[PDB]
Amino acid sequence: QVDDEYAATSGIMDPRIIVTTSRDPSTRLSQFAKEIKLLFPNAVRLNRGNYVMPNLVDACKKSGTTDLVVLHEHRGVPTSLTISHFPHGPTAQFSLHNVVMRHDIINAGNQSEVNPHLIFDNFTTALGKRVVCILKHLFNAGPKKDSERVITFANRGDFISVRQHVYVRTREGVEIAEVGPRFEMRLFELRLGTLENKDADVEWQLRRFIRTANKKDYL
Amino acid sequence: FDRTAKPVPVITSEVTESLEDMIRRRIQDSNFDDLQRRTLFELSDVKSSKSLAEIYEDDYTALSEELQKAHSEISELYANLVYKLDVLSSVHFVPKPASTETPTISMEDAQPLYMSNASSLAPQEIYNVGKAEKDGEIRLKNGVAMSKEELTREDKNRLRRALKRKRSK
Amino acid sequence: IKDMFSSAMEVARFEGAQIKTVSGIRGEIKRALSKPEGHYRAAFEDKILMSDIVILRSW
């Protein structure tokens, strides 16, 4: 069963998403928003400067987009990331620790950009199923059975680890290679409103300062 | 001392070899997540008033005679509802749509009327070219008929190959 | 938080440590502050006072 916010659109309409940057971005992260713009299909990159979060939200519900991807950084290393579904939908502020930008490596080429398959591992919690259904709808519906790039979202040890892979299938085994970013990622708060709202109801919030904080998983 | 939060995961090669060997298992089995498109009589105990001679006559002699009269009552009521409902919604006066056996003459005649009925149908729609009934011939969609005996084997190849890709599609 | 650790290297042996206060709020100590040799930034769960005394349990 899909989430109640995503229920009307779920398979019918393709999403259209916006990757935008915090405020006067460093030239490292302004590259890194383009890897997010490439990791999804139907993603455009609008450079942000002297926009407010109201009139960038309110001029996006108007034009009609599914959601909004905004990034932050520390000294060129990108740190944070939010996805916020627009028609009064939820938001998910992610902290992302271990990044490797694609422009560091080599001029190996350019990505496939075709509709990806996905891989969601180790999501057992009901809050884990929220993060499933809020990440999954950022991709265009119904990928082909033999499309060649697959995007894994793996959850070992409460850090959702996402990698980008291409694959080909040999005479015996599948052989893969990596393109695109390495993330670790961690959600830490989940509002029911958009990222504009700032007083919406908090579905989940990473409590740090609790006697059993380190004990549980998805807590 | 005790730390206050989970340490950020360290990506060893051991982690990735646990990860890319998961992806090969889900690609090769092709069980992976994706956003699929959204597509698009009870017998009556009560005694039958109709006699055995009468029931046979009905068999001897729209969807149902009772159901159509249900449909005809219920559309006469709905057009009464739209009028009163329509009047409140409308900002201008609206006349009642309706006020609810011998030959019946239509007040307004639809279409050209003088023009013949045959003219309205398109030429394409009264003859599509079709595959011939004999096995010994093949007729194409444009009207280029081909027998099976005047073909060459290399033309036999392409036509079976052409009817392969259209049937496969 | 000042004058708990002497050097900026001493803090780095102890980062990630579950610091608590008198008032009963928790936290962690995260990075050794550089420009003075001793101090460090520490994220608590709520706003610490000035009148308040942090204590790190140890054995």
Partner: peptide
């Protein structure tokens, strides 16, 4: 390194704790 020890033993001394408790209650 001490974080990965202080966490892992404290998880063992709770994961061994509920087993030793629930073995009391059922008996």
């Amino acid at each position: 390194f001490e974080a990965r020890q202080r966490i892992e033993e404290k998880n063992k001394e709770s994961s061994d704790y509920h087993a030793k408790m629930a073995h009391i209650v059922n008996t």
